[PDB]
């Protein structure tokens, strides 16, 4: 079971304060594991999974974000990003912190979630789902 939804309360172009978040979605899990697994699907800045700064869709600016980070903790997540905090955690609602300080240039910004809650190991026997939850969020800026 799992269920990755992203809500962006704030549209755009509202002047972004250094770190007023925007997209805070929810992963959900019931397994035998010590972490959510969540990414954003916008590439990757140094090579974390924590916080890490995205870019728009207009190949034209950045918007960044915390979440991943906030004390989460860096796991093995197909793709760079992908870290994990509590998990076993019946689910928990990450927000992602806009690292603005200023104002995020104009255009529209997409961002993609997907906090899988499990994480595949090298374990004796079980079953096998390493995709994820799949989410979207873009931040039309104007």
């Known amino acids: 079971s799992a269920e990755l939804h992203l809500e962006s309360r704030g549209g755009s172009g509202t ?82 912190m806009a690292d603005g300080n200023q104002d995020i240039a104009p255009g529209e910004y997409r961002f993609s979630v997907g906090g899988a809650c499990v994480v595949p190991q090298e374990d004796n026997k079980q079953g096998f789902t390493p995709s994820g939850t799949t989410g979207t969020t873009k931040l039309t800026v104007t």
Not at 27 to 53: K, L, P, S
Request: hydrophobic share 30%; proline share 2%.
């Open 15 to 96: 002047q972004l304060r250094d770190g007023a978040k925007v997209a805070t979605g929810r992963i959900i899990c019931r397994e035998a594991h010590t972490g959510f697994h969540v990414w954003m699907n916008e590439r990757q800045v140094d090579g974390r999974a924590e916080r890490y700064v995205v870019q728009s869709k207009d190949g034209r600016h950045e918007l960044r974000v915390r979440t991943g980070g906030d004390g989460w903790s860096p796991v093995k997540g197909e793709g760079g990003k992908g870290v994990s905090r509590p998990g076993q955690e019946e689910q928990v609602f990450f927000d992602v």
